[PDB]
Structure formats: C-alpha cells, structure tokens
Design a protein around this ligand. Sequence first.
Ligand SMILES: Cc1cc2c(cc1C)N(C[C@H](O)[C@H](O)[C@H](O)COP(=O)(O)O)c1[nH]c(=O)[nH]c(=O)c1N2
Ligand SMILES: Cc1cc2c(cc1C)N(C[C@H](O)[C@H](O)[C@H](O)COP(=O)(O)O)c1[nH]c(=O)[nH]c(=O)c1N2
Ligand SMILES: O=C(O)c1cc(=O)[nH]c(=O)[nH]1
Lengths: 312, 312
Amino acid sequence: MSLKVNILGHEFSNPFMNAAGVLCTTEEDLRRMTESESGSLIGKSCTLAPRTGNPEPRYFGLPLGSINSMGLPNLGVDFYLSYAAQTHDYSRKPLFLSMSGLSVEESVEMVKKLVPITKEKGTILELNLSAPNVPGKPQVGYDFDTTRTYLQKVSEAYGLPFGVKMPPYFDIAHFDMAAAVLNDFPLVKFITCVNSIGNGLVIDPANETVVIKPKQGFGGLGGKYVLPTALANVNAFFRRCPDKLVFGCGGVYSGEEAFLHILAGASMVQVGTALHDEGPIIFARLNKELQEIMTNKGYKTLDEFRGRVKTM
Amino acid sequence: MSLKVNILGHEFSNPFMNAAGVLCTTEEDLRRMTESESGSLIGKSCTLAPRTGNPEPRYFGLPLGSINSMGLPNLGVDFYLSYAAQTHDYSRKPLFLSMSGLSVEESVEMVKKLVPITKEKGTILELNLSAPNVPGKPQVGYDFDTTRTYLQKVSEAYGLPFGVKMPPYFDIAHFDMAAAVLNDFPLVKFITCVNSIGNGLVIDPANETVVIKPKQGFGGLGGKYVLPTALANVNAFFRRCPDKLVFGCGGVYSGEEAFLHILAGASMVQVGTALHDEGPIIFARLNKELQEIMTNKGYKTLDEFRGRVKTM
Ligand SMILES: Cc1cc2c(cc1C)N(C[C@H](O)[C@H](O)[C@H](O)COP(=O)(O)O)c1[nH]c(=O)[nH]c(=O)c1N2
Ligand SMILES: Cc1cc2c(cc1C)N(C[C@H](O)[C@H](O)[C@H](O)COP(=O)(O)O)c1[nH]c(=O)[nH]c(=O)c1N2
Ligand SMILES: O=C(O)c1cc(=O)[nH]c(=O)[nH]1
C-alpha cells in the first residue's frame, strides 16, 4: 500500500512537503520539517544578501485560508547553502532549496554557488518566478520574454536538473504560452503549481481597515481560495509538458485534497496555509488520510491514478 | 437614511444589481429583475447572432461558490436591443446591456445599433472584455494591445460614455498597465471588477471525474472564492482611475460583503452566484442588511464611507 515517489534518482517515503516559505526560514524551522513525517522539505525562497522583509503586520490567518505580504524575509543564500552542505540529514529525506533572486544577475550568482552542493549531496533547486509581495518587483512568470531570459541564464549557469515555482494562470492562452517557454528548456524537470493567488485584499468591517500594512493591504492569498486554481494549473501543465513533472501546491488541508492533486497530475504535494495553522504534525495525518483513500479505491501505488482524472 | 446612488446623470434607488450572466437571458428573467428591489439590472452578455452555449453539464454549485462554462447563451443582440427600446420600464430603474462580441469587428457593429436606443432611452453599455468560457477565445482583458483596439474602436463607433467588465488581475504591474490603457479612453466612465476567476478545475473525489463537461472541466469561479480578488481589483482601479467610477462584482452574499465593496470604492454592487442560489428576493435582503450595518455605524448615506477604506 505504497505512498512512495521515485523521481530524479531519489526515493521519497511519501509525496508531501512544506510549501516554500512556511516553516523553513531558520535552522530550527528546517530541523522540525526534517523530524516530521513529510517526504521532503524546502528552504525559504532566499536572496543573495539577507532580508528582514515587509513591515508588520504582514500575515493574517483567515477562516478560508491566509493573506500575507512577507517580503522574502531570509538569512541569505550563504545560510541555506551551509544548511544544505553541513547540517541537513539526507538519510532522512531529500532537500529542495527555493531561490528568488530579485534580478537575473542575482539569480545567476546564487545558483552558481549551489552547483557543488547539488553534486555532492543531490540538493534540488526550485527557482521562484512568482514572488508577489516585493514592492516594485512584478511576478516574472507573468512576463514570458523575461521568464525565457531567466530559464536561459539559470540553465547555462546551473547546468543541472532544476524546477520552477510558477504563479497561477487563469487563461488557456497563458497555459499555452507558459508551456511553449518551459518546453524549450530540458533542464527544467519539474514545475510547482501554484504560488499564492497574488494581490488580494482583506478588509475588517469592524474598524473599516485593511488587515496588513504593506502595499495598502494587498497580499498573496492561500488555503481554500486556491484549490480550483491549483488543480487546473497542475492538470494543464501535466498535459502540455509531458517530459516534465508537476508538483501541486494550493488548498491542501486533508488527504482528499492531496488525492485530487495527484489525480490531476501531481508527483509531490506542498502544504502552506494548513501547515502554518496546524504545525508539522499535519504530515502524520496527511499520510494516513491518503492511504485510507487509496485502500478504499483499491489503488496500490500513486502511479496507477496520477494524472488519470476523467473528463466527460 | 438613504441608499440612493447618483451617477451617470441617473438616480439609482440602491447600489445593487445582478451580475451579467445571471437572471438576465430571457424576457421573464429581465421582468423579474425589473420587479425586484434591485437598484438596476443588466442584460446577458450578447453576440450578433443567437447562441445556445456549451454542452451540459455546464454549471456546478459548490460549498464556497460556483464553477461554470455556460458559453455565452443569449437570444442575440436584436432581442436585447428590442427589450431596451420597447419592453423595459425605465420609471422602475435604469437598464444596462452587456455586449460581448467575439471580435472587434462584431462588437463595432453591435455598439452602432445601441447608439439610437441610448439617445432615445438612456440605456447604458457594459463592454465585456473577460469571457473566459468560449472555447479557443482568450480573455481580451489580459491582452493590452487587443484591449486598446477594442476601446479605440468602440469609442469611435459608440461615441457615448460606456463601461467595461474587466477580468481579475493579480499583479501590480498588470494593475498599472490595465489603468494606463483605460486612462487613454475618456468615454470609459466605469470599470466593473471583477468577472470570474477563469479556468478553475473541480474534481469529485468519489468518481475521479470533473464536474463540468466543456473544456476538459475548466470553468470560471464565482462566490466566496473571489471576494479578496474582487476587493483588491475594485480598490486598485479606484485609486488608479480617479476620473472613472468602479463597479464591484464578486463574493457578495450579504450586507457585509456589500459594505466592504463600497468601502473599497464601488458605486454599484453586482451579485452573481448568490442570486443564482437565492433568486431575486436577495435584493430585498441586501437592502435591509446594508441599512442595519450603516445604522449600527451611524451612517445616513453611502457617501459617508464609499472609498474610505483605511490603511496603516
Ligand atoms: C507565510 C507564507 C510565506 C510564504 C508563502 C506562503 C505563506 C502563507 N508562499 C506561498 C506558498 O509557497 C504557497 O504556494 C501558497 O501559500 C499556496 O499554498 P497553500 O494554499 O497555502 O497551501 C511562498 N512561496 C514561495 O515560493 N516562497 C516563499 O518564500 C513563500 N513564502
Ligand atoms: C451562470 C453564470 C453566468 C455568467 C457569469 C456567472 C455565472 C455564475 N458571469 C460572471 C459574473 O458576472 C460575475 O462577474 C462572477 O460570477 C463573480 O460574481 P459572483 O461571485 O458570482 O457574485 C458572467 N459575466 C459576464 O460579464 N457575462 C456573462 O454572460 C456571464 N455569465
Ligand atoms: O457566458 C459565459 O460563459 C460567461 C461570460 C463571462 O463574461 N464570464 C463567465 O464566467 N462566463
């Protein structure tokens, strides 16, 4: 009754990891993910130099999910490389790093340093082309000319299999255009769909005020607001990019929702808002709920239903 | 104590109307909207020739809203033009017509036909630039050069103040570019934010099957899913297009969501998924629920709080 995932030469005990930026900024945070029942983990979307991020308040838990304008608070690339080279326990689970250079020049600089650590430890790169909360910096995934420039430059520079965190698309034409770009880059081996539904706004009727400080209350949305969007993006790139893997991210609160992600195409399944609400104990119950579902449906591996959602 | 809205030279008895697509396709639909307590109504987004729309099933109610790929079912432009000129009762309330020609050429011909009915009767145009459910037709709203052409050409052929139904944007640079375009066209008097979050995917875990037939199950999302997005968009255009009104659309089930929309800058508040659920008696309930909120807060009119959302 296997939850195992076998990708890029690595063995994963189950399909579940943290969403980049939830429980992964500090050494303490990464330790707790390692010690959880998650199949893998990913470090914070990091920058060349350390950042403190946006001013406070910048996070608000919502009845149907979360809004945030974090602003890439991170200990800089040298801290996470160090964690990846010296500290992390690989015999426990593989490690993804997320990198979110604010310019292609910056991203080139950071991936060049990761090359020898990937070689020795097999650390996996997820390149972030979303990042919706940095004031003044637009999401790269929404500019297909600039996306091409990043993939080009990171491909040449990194010279090894990597992945990409994509912003949500909401138009068939966009799915097609994103696809035509990604498929010109054979080193892009996986696509994470999706990041926060960007630039939403929550207002408190009681004091008639926005609930976060940065960018006049505008922040990225997560949780139940995003499942339909996430499922669609995973499925759309599963069909359009068959030489690549899809990782699902968005709206995972339970095993049911993990199951729908896999059904739409997902190899690995990331958890953000639910993980932030419940703590890493969630992984233990996500593993048991997905097993229950597969047991009831008579599925022995993830592979006999991955991508096999039925249409009418 | 008053809910009156004074815009476009017109008096509206309240700010509430139907969203385009909902209870507005047939003569009975439009009579019922007209006999409702709604401040206004809008006809179904029409085309030059009649359409029966996508194959069934094409609408699926959800706990947190709705998913749909209706496909612009409509009795053709001539039907709605005839309704506006001969049937509708303008003493009861003003009328909008939504027009969604599928090419600039189709739209131009349609808008010309309205000119003499607007002049005679005062019928208002909402140019629809976000039809996400017609197979193989991208949402115009997401192409700014295409959007420009539509607005140029409708400005030339129509030559009277009109409005636009926008798709939701999720990037600040997209808000900037949308507004730069809109601000070159002074005949554009109002911006309706927002249309459905396009191309979501719902899968029923029981049968592993999508819940809608068209486009492999991909459809637009209404209801609770959309409220954060609707508010942000409303407020973003409110700030960036100060010489235009903003109309609010998305996630409105009650007095409170109506209050939020207005607070973020909305003049009129359109109601979709909730009106589908409840039928036209929801307009009576929204009038009452909004008056309660205003009474409790000490407000006598909408102008006390419209656009007065507070930041930190
Ligand atoms: C507090 C917090 C912080 C971050 C995020 C989210 C939240 C809630 N997200 C987005 C996250 O990775 C995920 O894609 C979304 O939250 C959607 O997943 P859920 O719906 O929340 O499960 C995020 N994504 C990313 O690529 N890098 C990051 O540094 C962050 N930071
Ligand atoms: C059945 C149905 C049909 C349509 C729609 C919706 C639904 C549910 N919508 C979108 C609608 O106008 C509105 O923008 C969204 O539904 C968001 O509002 P709610 O959250 O649903 O209130 C829509 N919009 C539009 O401009 N013209 C249309 O013909 C339609 N058709
Ligand atoms: O008729 C439809 O399918 C339709 C039109 C539109 O503008 N938006 C939507 O969600 N559906």
